[PDB]
Every structure is written in C-alpha cells, then in structure tokens.
Design a protein around this ligand. Structure first.
Ligand SMILES: [Zn+2]
Ligand SMILES: [Zn+2]
Ligand SMILES: [Zn+2]
Ligand SMILES: [Zn+2]
Lengths: 111, 125
C-alpha cells in the first residue's frame, strides 16, 4: 500500500530507468517532505534553483529562470521582474529590489 | 489477490507508486492540494535532473541548519550565533577545499567559497 504521484507517462518510464539507488533516494525525499511539510516551500525552491543553475550560471533569485548572460539577467531584473514576494519565505515587500535584497541576505541567494 | 510480476506499473496513468506506511499514507492525504502539487513538482525536477539526488543530502542539511540559524557556512553547513562569529569561522577556521555539493577541488577554501556561490548560488558575506 502507498501513494501515486501523478507524473506524466514519459516521466514515469524515465523514472523506472533510474537506478534503484536513485529511486529510493527519490521516495526517501518525498517521505521527508510528508513528515516535514513545512520543508516543501523551500526545497521546491532550491531544487528549482539548482535545476536552473545547471542550464546557466545566470539565474534570477525571484523567478528562478536561467539567462544567457549576466547582461540579460541584469536587463530582466531591471525591467521584467516584478515579484513582490520572496519565493522561499513568502514575506511581502513594497519593492522587488527589497525582495532581491532579502533573498540574498536572509536566504543566501545572490546575483 | 496479488500479482507481483505485473508490468502495468510501468504504464499506469496515476503515475509513480511510492510504497508507504499507514502513518504517512494518511498524513499524505492530509496535505493540502497545494502541498501535494509541490511534492509532484520536486519529484518531476528530480526525474529530469537526477544529479540533484546526489546533492540532496547537502540541501536538507542546509535547510536544517538554516532553521537553527540565519548564519550558516556553505562549506560545512554549521550554524553560528551571529554574522560576526560566522566570518570569524570562515576567515580562521574553515579549511575545506572540496565543494560540499559538486565535489570539485581547489587551491584555497576561498576559491571553494566563490565556487559554491558562483555555480551553486549559495553565498555569504
Ligand atoms: Zn526573475
Ligand atoms: Zn524569504
Ligand atoms: Zn564551514
Ligand atoms: Zn561545487
């Protein structure tokens, strides 16, 4: 007896091509999260940060999207990032720059 | 009635069957729809980037330390009372040359620091 995690058919056959070791690590991680659901918001963030970090070095701390260059990351932060809520802790702000500052200072995610 | 060697687990539409005990089974269907969504999103990310499984021990030790204190060292993941005591540790006491995440090696622990910030995005003053 157990639970079904509603993954797509591709991801399901992809899943079963992983090694038992990778597979028990995965279900060990979901068990940690079931026991500690307060952990979900933040591990979701970090797993997505590290995911984006694999695509490019230049990642946005608020939206977690990879960019080609530091110039384009700067241009996105300058005109295209309007998140007023820190994705890890959900603290709300008056400014996206303040949100950027908070994520760096409190959470260690800096550009 | 059981059928252990059945191969329809491979093509089930409900998806990945994670076997679980009675306590956490009920505790799973006690989660909000939003929490269940996050669990799926993480599992999907882990499926598409399986090297994050090898970095997971670090991630959950980071989070555990961050709960004890805001001031944590990226190389050893140990909490400190203040920022002043944290950078006393980094300046004088932290000697690891290996990145706790990717296992790449360096000349100085300061090069190890810059690396963990530049390519893993975990940064400290
Ligand atoms: Zn962004
Ligand atoms: Zn926050
Ligand atoms: Zn340390
Ligand atoms: Zn590394």
């Amino acid at each position: 007896k157990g639970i079904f995690i509603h993954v797509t058919l591709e991801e399901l056959k992809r899943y079963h091509q992983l090694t038992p070791e990778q597979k028990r690590l995965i279900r060990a991680i979901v068990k940690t999260l079931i026991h500690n659901p307060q952990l979900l918001d933040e591990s979701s963030y970090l797993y997505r940060l590290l995911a984006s970090k694999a695509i490019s070095q230049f990642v946005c701390p608020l939206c977690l999207m990879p960019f080609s260059s530091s110039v384009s990351l700067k241009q996105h932060i300058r005109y295209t990032e309007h998140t007023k809520v820190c994705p890890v802790c959900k603290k709300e702000f008056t400014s996206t720059d303040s949100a950027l500052d908070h994520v760096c200072k409190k959470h260690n995610i800096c550009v």
